[PDB]
Each structure stands twice: as structure tokens, then as C-alpha cells.
Design brief:
This is part of a larger assembly, with chains A (about 80 residues) and B (about 5 residues). By secondary structure, chain A is mainly alpha-helical. The longest helix of chain A has 22 residues. Chain A contains five helices and no strands. Chain B contains no helices and no strands. The relative contact order of chain B is 0.56. Classes of the chains: A mainly alpha (about 80), B little secondary structure (about 5). At the A-B interface, loops of A face loops of B. Chain A: It comes from Komagataella phaffii (strain GS115 / ATCC 20864).
């Protein structure tokens, strides 16, 4: 319902609220299915590379999948 | 520096 109502948001805050809602939906997916969570994580990272929680969660999921074989990514994020 | 991030 929040995503449906996002169409009525003022354009100034529309980008920020869309990013927030997509992050929340990606969290719900990560609870349900990690693949869609990672997809939305990539979508938001392309949309806003400056956000940290998205990158943290994406790298954390990658480390879970790669058994901590992305130490370079963690160092770069640090 | 991004007003969007702020």
C-alpha cells in the first residue's frame, strides 16, 4: 500500500521516499528470499551509491554466499 | 555533500 501511495508523493521527496521504500521491500525480501533482496540492493546502489546500509547488507549477503571470500569488498567499504 | 542523502 505504501508503494502504491508513492505515486502520489511530491516530486521533491519522491526520490528519497522511493529509495526508503525500496530498501524496506529489499529487507522484507531478504527475510523471504535473498535473491530479490540482492536484486533490489543492486538497483538502489545504482540509484544511490552513497547509501551505506544497502551496501553493508549486499556485501554481507555476498559474504554469506561466498563464505567470506570478498575481503577486498569489505576493506573497500571500510 | 548530496542534499538527497541529508
Amino acid at each position: 500500500q505504501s508503494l502504491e501511495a508513492l505515486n502520489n508523493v511530491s516530486p521533491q521527496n519522491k526520490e528519497a521516499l522511493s529509495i526508503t521504500l525500496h530498501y524496506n521491500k529489499a529487507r522484507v525480501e531478504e527475510v523471504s528470499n535473498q535473491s530479490e533482496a540482492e536484486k533490489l540492493y543492486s538497483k538502489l546502489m545504482e540509484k544511490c551509491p552513497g547509501y551505506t546500509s544497502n551496501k553493508i547488507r549486499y556485501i554481507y549477503l555476498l559474504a554469506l554466499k561466498s563464505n567470506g571470500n570478498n575481503y577486498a569488498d569489505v576493506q573497500q567499504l571500510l | 555533500d548530496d542534499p538527497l542523502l541529508k
